[PDB]
């Protein structure tokens, strides 16, 4: 019976539900499972609610089942498809067909009508038939797991709370409640240490028969499994049942020595293949008989050895029992009970009876053939090699044979197939296997290979169904044990199993628990991979724990949620009371935040009680779920549903905002319709991998996602027409990544030192730039010190490339903490307060101790750096209601009915209407300046509609549905921005009214490729090229006459530090850049041609000649900025500060041995500069209207009055003789001849004047920054940033009239000191505090030029006016001939005083912390002072942005970027699309963290009854 290929399934599971968003307030689709996600919020307390579609009774789990590819054989016609469930049979006949399917959708439901839960493993069996033998049918059955119906944790009407969970301790699934799913039976398996140490024993055996835990063993060299459990171990002279108890007792006494045992599923007698007697045993007391060596029943062979190759018999056909064998080997037991024993070389038969027959034997030399490495052949016609093993598949009765490291299996067919391996004749079939010293195999069919060569290699990998290998237990060793005797091959006892260390392991055995046993002879041992589960502490919990968080569940006997504990600190943080069919009805949080919920006799929850005692009511519906939640008034949210699928149909805010949902009987949301119009698509698909096609209706992104559901990874897909991202996710979550921009991230997991096996931790980042030196590796280490039963300090370093950077050792004996370096620089001790707060940062090196306490609600109560600070008070609702200061100053937050009313100490009235959700609805001024705003809904996009005093010129900001900014607009002048979006999800083009700035990106990688601004004959084109991500090359090319051309070129060194920077402008290259850095710390040693030098807070920016230092003070501000030139005191100032830390005294010295200058600065109570002096005589003062406005003052040099006038709106319009023109739509018009022309952008770029006549252009470019001044006088100017770190900080300027270039040296904080014309010469800059230029001298530290500078940074006195600079007054472009300061996106005026550009995202900054503010506020009138988080590495000088990539540079510095221009270095970190995108975001924030009402997608200001109503969908599809 032979020419009769076996059939190929096809089948495909449904994904797992492990997908979700990690900040929910951005993202409500994952099309992983379509399973829609929705956050909404309690008010009084950040713990939410969640929404999970998985949990939906109709999510029903799709089993798609395909037969064909159209290659059906010409002998086989019907098709007896069969699945088999947890009591639900399925059976359907099918006549053969092309291409023919079939989709069997489960109810998640047992037949019995029972809701299952947890995993499950349903049996499919794909059945043909053929026309040749039409009695024999193919059967080939394979197994997939099925979600069932998810545990119902708090009863919410199908509704999930954010912080709560349950845990399945039955099947091993941590149900979190945030919207997570952690699978704990679907982690990589525990391996625990069950049998003793790795000392030795003798023959005799004392102490042999009690518990066997620390018992010493002699060589346990086979294992057995056991319907009892029993774990059968050839101690090589005694069988031992371990019990399923502590008591391990021995039952007989006896390479030859190392005999293999066996286990009868059906009888619960013990089977032992003695080699060297030449007998088959069976036991008659497992208990124990007297003697150990007479309690063996023989079976066959009785010691006499038979034939060694004769086909005759070796005393077959007649009894089993009289019969004789030569060189039995290990055997198995078929569950119809025909044991199937080695003897010899060949596979020998016993029935029921004693009987030996042959299935199939060997010495057929009729078929001495080659392997058959593709099909199967005849029964009797098959050479072996070499058995030496078997197991018995109980699913499909099959027999797998170890023929020389290839498994061969034996079917119900008479056939031999290969199920694994491939032996030296010609996947798992594919690969090649070697020292498979022992099998075995589980009850869903999985195989198990030991391969061990004592070299390096101990290991067991395993075969599923499919034919597929995968390293499951035995780490790659590097110490070989063979040769180093005393090397220690035991390694991480209770780790991983990928982590475990073997040394040659001997037997395998499969529990029907899953439990397989390991015989280790090198660690005398019995290790068990047994599947993972939740451990059981002394007091009988579960400590299961997910750093995510960074936390710490205990749960209780039945598994549910009883406290929450922060993992590092050991602190507790909740309280979760009960009822008596413990179900949660209270939260306690630390602070006593007590979130009280009541239930209904049917356990329903009705009313909601907060911690700020606001009820908040529930409702129920038909089919027993939530349908909105109310609180006093307003229905804040609205849910109904189709019919009793419990699928969410539509969901409801208070406004209007009814999107409405589509699904399939299956459960897959495929229409998600936004009230704008946008909708979605979704064609869900399966295939080899399941793919899904989403089709946004506003844009032509169709994402293809498909699915390779592999036994190693998820290896998923995205595609977008060019671009492919594609993510490996271990089971463990081992996130490794396929960008298409060749960056390839690989994220690691250790257990945590605390939780234990159950905890997946990254610790360990691995990021792979496609090149040369793109590997960067940062580490963690973490330690603990346990003193009796609980943790006493517990310890993390990082460590980037190899070397320590940060010691933070944390405490708690006392609570303390002690962030430190090794080299004893950097200290900083924290206390705690006792709910797990930091309460006193104590840093030291002449430093300030801040101690903050806390309020009782919850909140900060009092921050005091010394002698500088404030406290507050608090409401019953956690508002704010005073702000007093430690200067006497105090604040008052004076609330009314949901409005409120900021007063100062000098009545200034802040009326702010508010939503109830505090978004901004009204703000009224001190005057009447009322500001009422809205938030529309348009088609297509919102509208966030700003409204002036008395003006129909609206500025309006639209966005998208994630959130993407599309069109701003001043309705003034009827100027607007258009943005076009393409493939990328990204920004592509600007509009506005001339002008087009075309992105576009890159095809094989991804990144921007060209930023082409083209308005006029003018063409502004910058093309870009990088390593991977990161760039290394752009270019400035331009097109018409005196402009020029400019590219740069930069280099790295084993990190992502950007090392020398080198670039060409105007055809003539510059020397070298030298960033030498500090690895060890992340310090700067040097850049440019200065160096830096610390010295324990200090600076010394010095060369061998020039010297920059800085004294900082004791509460970490700059104090004193000393300079000297040739050794000699050349400029020196000194900064005081007030109980405020703004600047009082300032003795500037400047000049070698002229006369000193000082000042001191009169402040307010309101807290501005309101009169300055000079040394000896008052010289200053400034007047302020009601709004801030600042109306009268005195001029730079004259001693006038100079008045000033407003209008409603704080727009400017005259200073003393000149009147300003601030126009409808709030641009500066006019300027006494001066007539200017911004932009669309808010930006400058033409300046006219019709008296004085001379005009100046201010060429831009698409990145809304400065390129090109062009006065009509004859200055030219143009500019070039070579810095990326800070890519609006300004490096190189070209000088058309002189045909020369000033490049530009900054600080470490971003001052500017040093000027080197590339002409060739050199100037010494010394700046102040503010950043701006004061003193310019030459090499040889003369005085080439002296600034004294007013309270707002005008001219008052030069000492030389020729040689001008652009850089002024805190550091922004100053010009001479317009009088405005350019900072990075506004203009700021030496004459008004003010800004000159009103902010739009102010109200957004406005909106969170409100202040003394104004449309056109300079530094919140606070011109001379710069900057509490208490605590920053970067004040010791531990600038980590070198060091640790992904982490944000300290911005200190004015000058804002654009909207585009902060697009542009985000390189492929988009706002995320789908939900793969949400995983890899959790795990490089929470990889990154360091230390220890909400809002929305942009909606900034309050919500309008639109005209789409609540409850009514509109829909626009492209
Ligand atoms: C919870 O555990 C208790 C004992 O620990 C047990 O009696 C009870 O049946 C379990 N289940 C529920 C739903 O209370
Ligand atoms: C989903 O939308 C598409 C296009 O608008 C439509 O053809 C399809 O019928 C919709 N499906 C459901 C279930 O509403
Ligand atoms: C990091 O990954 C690269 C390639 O992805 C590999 O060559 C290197 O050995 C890995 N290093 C570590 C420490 O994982
Ligand atoms: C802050 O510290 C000082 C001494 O360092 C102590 O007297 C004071 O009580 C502390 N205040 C708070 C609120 O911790
Ligand atoms: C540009 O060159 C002219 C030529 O005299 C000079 O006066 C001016 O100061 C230069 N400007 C800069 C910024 O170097």
Redesign the pocket.
């Known amino acids: 019976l032979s020419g009769f290929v076996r059939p190929s399934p096809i089948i495909v599971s449904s994904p797992l539900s492990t997908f979700f968003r990690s900040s929910p307030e951005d993202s409500p689709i994952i099309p992983e499972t379509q399973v829609l996600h929705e956050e909404t919020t309690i008010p009084g307390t950040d713990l939410k609610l969640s929404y999970l579609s998985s949990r939906a009774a109709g999510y029903k789990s799709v089993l798609k089942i395909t037969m064909t590819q159209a290659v059906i054989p010409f002998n086989l016609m019907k098709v007896h498809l069969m699945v088999a469930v947890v009591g639900r049979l399925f059976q359907k006949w099918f006549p053969a067909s092309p291409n023919l399917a079939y989709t069997f959708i489960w109810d998640k439901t047992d037949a019995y009508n029972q809701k299952v839960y947890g995993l499950s493993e349903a049996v499919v069996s794909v059945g043909y038939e053929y026309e040749s033998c039409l009695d024999l049918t193919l059967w080939e059955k394979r197994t997939a797991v099925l979600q069932g119906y998810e545990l119902d944790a708090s009863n919410m009407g199908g509704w999930t709370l954010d912080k709560h969970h349950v845990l399945d301790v039955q099947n091993g699934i941590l149900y979190k409640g945030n919207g997570e799913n952690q699978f704990i039976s679907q982690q990589p398996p525990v391996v625990s240490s069950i049998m003793g140490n790795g000392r030795r024993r003798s023959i005799s055996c004392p102490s042999c028969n009690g518990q066997a835990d620390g018992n010493k063993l002699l060589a346990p060299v086979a294992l057995a499994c056991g319907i009892d459990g029993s774990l059968y171990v050839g101690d090589f002279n005694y069988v031992r049942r371990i019990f399923p108890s502590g008591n391990v007792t021995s039952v007989l006494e006896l390479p030859a020595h190392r005999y293999y045992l066996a286990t009868d599923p059906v009888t619960g007698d013990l089977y032992v293949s003695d080699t060297n007697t030449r007998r088959i045993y069976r036991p008659k007391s497992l208990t124990g008989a007297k003697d150990l060596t007479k309690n063996a029943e023989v079976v066959a062979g009785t010691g006499e050895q038979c034939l060694p190759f004769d086909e005759a018999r070796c005393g077959d056909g007649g009894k089993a029992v009289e019969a004789t064998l030569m060189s039995p080997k290990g055997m198995a037991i078929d569950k119809n009970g025909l044991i199937y024993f080695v003897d010899g070389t060949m596979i020998r038969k016993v029935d029921q009876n004693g009987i030996i027959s042959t299935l199939l034997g060997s010495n057929d030399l009729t078929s001495a053939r080659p392997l058959t490495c593709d099909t199967s052949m005849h029964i009797s016609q098959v050479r072996l090699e070499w058995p030496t093993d078997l197991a018995i598949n109980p699913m499909d009765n099959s027999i797998y044979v170890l023929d020389n490291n290839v498994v061969l299996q034996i079917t119900e067919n008479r056939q031999v197939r290969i199920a694994a391996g491939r032996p030296m004749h010609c996947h798992a079939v594919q690969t090649t296997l070697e020292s498979a010293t022992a099998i075995a195999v589980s009850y869903s069919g999985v195989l198990y290979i030991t391969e061990t060569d004592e070299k390096k290699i101990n290991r067991i990998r395993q075969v599923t169904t499919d034919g597929e290998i995968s390293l499951v237990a035995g780490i790659p060793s590097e110490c070989d044990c063979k040769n180093d005797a005393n090397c220690d091959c035991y390694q991480s006892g209770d780790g991983y199993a990928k982590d475990a260390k073997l040394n040659a392991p001997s037997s395998l055995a499969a529990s029907p628990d899953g439990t397989l046993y390991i015989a280790d002879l090198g660690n005398i041992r019995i290790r068990a991979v047994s599947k993972n589960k939740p451990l059981l502490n002394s007091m009988n919990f579960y400590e299961v724990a997910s750093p995510t968080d960074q936390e710490l569940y205990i749960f209780d ?2 598994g549910t949620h009883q406290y929450t504990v922060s993992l590092v600190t050991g602190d507790y943080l909740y309280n979760f009371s009960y009822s008596n ?2 179900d949660v009805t209270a939260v306690t949080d630390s602070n006593g935040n007590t979130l009280r919920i009541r239930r209904d006799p049917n356990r329903m929850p009705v009313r909601v009680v907060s911690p700020d005692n606001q009820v908040i009511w529930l409702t129920i519906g038909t089919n027993g779920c939530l349908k909105s939640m109310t609180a006093q008034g307003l229905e804040l949210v609205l849910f109904t549903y189709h019919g009793n699928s419990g699928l969410l149909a539509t969901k409801s805010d208070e406004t209007g905002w009814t999107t409405f949902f589509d699904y399939d009987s299956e459960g897959r949301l495929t229409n998600v319709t936004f009230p704008t119009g946008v909708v979605t698509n979704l064609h869900g698909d399966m295939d080899k991998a399941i793919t899904v096609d989403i089709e946004s209706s506003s844009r032509e992104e169709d994402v293809s996602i498909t699915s390779n559901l592999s036994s190693i990874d998820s290896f998923y897909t995205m595609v977008q027409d060019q671009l492919r991202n594609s993510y490996q996710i271990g089971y463990d979550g081992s996130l490794r990544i396929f960008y298409a921009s060749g960056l390839d991230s690989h994220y690691q997991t250790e257990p945590h030192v605390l939780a234990g096996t159950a905890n997946p931790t990254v610790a360990k980042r691995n990021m792979t730039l496609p090149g040369e030196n793109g590997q960067n590796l940062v580490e963690w280490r973490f330690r603990k010190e346990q003193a009796q039963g609980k943790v006493n300090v517990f310890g993390r370093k990082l460590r980037v490339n190899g070397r320590n950077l940060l010691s933070v050792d944390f405490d708690r004996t006392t609570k303390t903490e002690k962030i430190y370096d090794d080299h004893r620089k950097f200290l900083l001790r924290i206390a705690y307060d006792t709910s797990g707060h930091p309460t006193l940062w104590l840093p030291s090196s002449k430093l300030m101790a801040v101690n903050v306490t806390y309020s009782s609600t919850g909140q900060i109560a009092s921050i005091q750096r010394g002698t500088t600070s404030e406290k507050v008070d608090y409401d019953s609702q956690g508002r704010i209601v005073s702000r007093v200061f430690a200067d006497g100053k105090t604040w008052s937050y004076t609330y009314l009915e949901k409005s409120m009313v900021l007063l100062l100490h000098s009545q200034r009235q802040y009326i702010f209407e508010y939503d109830m959700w505090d978004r901004l609805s009204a703000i009224t001024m001190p005057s009447v300046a009322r500001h009422t705003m809205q938030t529309i809904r348009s088609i297509g996009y919102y509208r966030n509609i700003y409204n002036p005093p008395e003006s129909n010129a609206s500025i309006i900001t639209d966005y998208n549905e994630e959130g993407l900014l599309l069109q701003t607009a001043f309705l003034g002048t009827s100027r607007r921005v258009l943005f076009k979006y393409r493939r990328q999800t990204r920004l592509s083009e600007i509009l506005y009214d001339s002008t087009r700035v075309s992105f576009t990106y890159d095809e094989t990688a991804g990144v921007l490729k060209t930023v082409n601004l083209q308005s006029d004959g003018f063409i502004c084109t910058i093309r870009y090229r990088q390593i991977g991500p990161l760039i290394d090359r752009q270019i400035f090319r331009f097109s018409e006459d005196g402009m020029v051309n400019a590219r740069f070129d930069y280099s790295y060194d084993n990190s992502f530090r950007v090392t020398s920077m080198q670039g060409v402008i105007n055809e003539t290259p510059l020397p070298i850049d030298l960033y030498q850095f500090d690895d060890i710390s992340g310090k700067v040693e040097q850049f440019g041609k200065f160096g830096v030098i610390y010295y324990d807070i200090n600076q010394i920016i010095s060369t061998a000649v020039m010297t920059y230092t800085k004294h900082f003070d004791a509460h970490g501000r700059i104090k004193e900025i000393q300079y000297e030139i040739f050794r000699s005191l050349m400029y020196w100032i000194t900064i005081q500060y007030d109980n405020m830390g703004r600047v009082t005294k300032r003795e500037i010295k400047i000049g070698p041995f002229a006369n000193t200058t000082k000042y001191a600065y009169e402040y307010d109570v309101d807290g501005q500069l309101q009169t300055v002096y000079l040394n000896e005589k008052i010289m200053w003062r400034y007047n302020y209207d009601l709004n801030g406005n600042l109306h009268l003052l005195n001029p730079s040099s004259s001693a006038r009055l100079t008045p000033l006038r407003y209008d409603l709106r704080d727009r400017i319009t005259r200073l003393g003789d000149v009147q300003y023109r601030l126009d409808e739509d709030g641009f500066l018009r006019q300027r006494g001849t001066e007539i200017f022309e911004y932009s669309s952008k808010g930006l400058l770029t033409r300046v006219y004047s019709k008296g004085s006549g001379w005009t100046v252009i201010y060429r831009y470019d698409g990145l809304g920054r400065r390129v090109s001044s062009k006065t009509s006088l004859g200055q030219h100017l143009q500019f070039f940033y070579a810095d990326l770190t800070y890519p609006t900080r300004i490096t190189h300027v070209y000088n058309h009239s002189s045909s020369e270039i000033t490049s530009l040296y900054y600080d470490l904080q971003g001052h500017l000191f040093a000027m080197e014309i590339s002409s060739g010469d050199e100037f010494y800059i010394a700046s102040d505090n503010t950043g701006t230029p004061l003193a310019v001298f030459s090499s040889n530290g003369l005085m080439l030029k002296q600034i004294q500078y007013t309270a707002y940074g005008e001219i008052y006195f030069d000492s030389n006016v020729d040689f001008q600079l652009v850089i002024g007054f805190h550091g922004g472009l100053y010009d001479p001939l317009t009088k405005l300061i350019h900072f990075g996106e506004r203009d700021y005026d030496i004459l008004a005083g003010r800004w000159t550009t009103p902010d739009i995202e102010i109200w957004k900054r406005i909106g969170k912390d409100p202040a003394p503010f104004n449309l056109y506020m300079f530094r919140n009138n606070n011109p001379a002072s710069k900057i509490d988080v208490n605590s920053w590495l970067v004040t010791f000088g531990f600038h980590l942005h070198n060091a640790i990539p992904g982490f944000p540079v300290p911005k200190f510095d004015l000058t804002e970027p654009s909207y585009e221009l902060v697009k542009s270095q985000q390189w492929e970190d988009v706002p995320p699309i789908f939900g793969v995108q949400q995983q890899v975001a959790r795990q490089a924030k929470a990889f990154l963290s360091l230390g220890k009402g909400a809002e929305q997608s942009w909606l900034w200001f309050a919500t309008v009854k639109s005209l789409i109503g609540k409850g009514v969908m509109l829909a626009v599809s492209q």
Do not use: A, L, S, V
């Open positions: 006997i039945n069919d413990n």
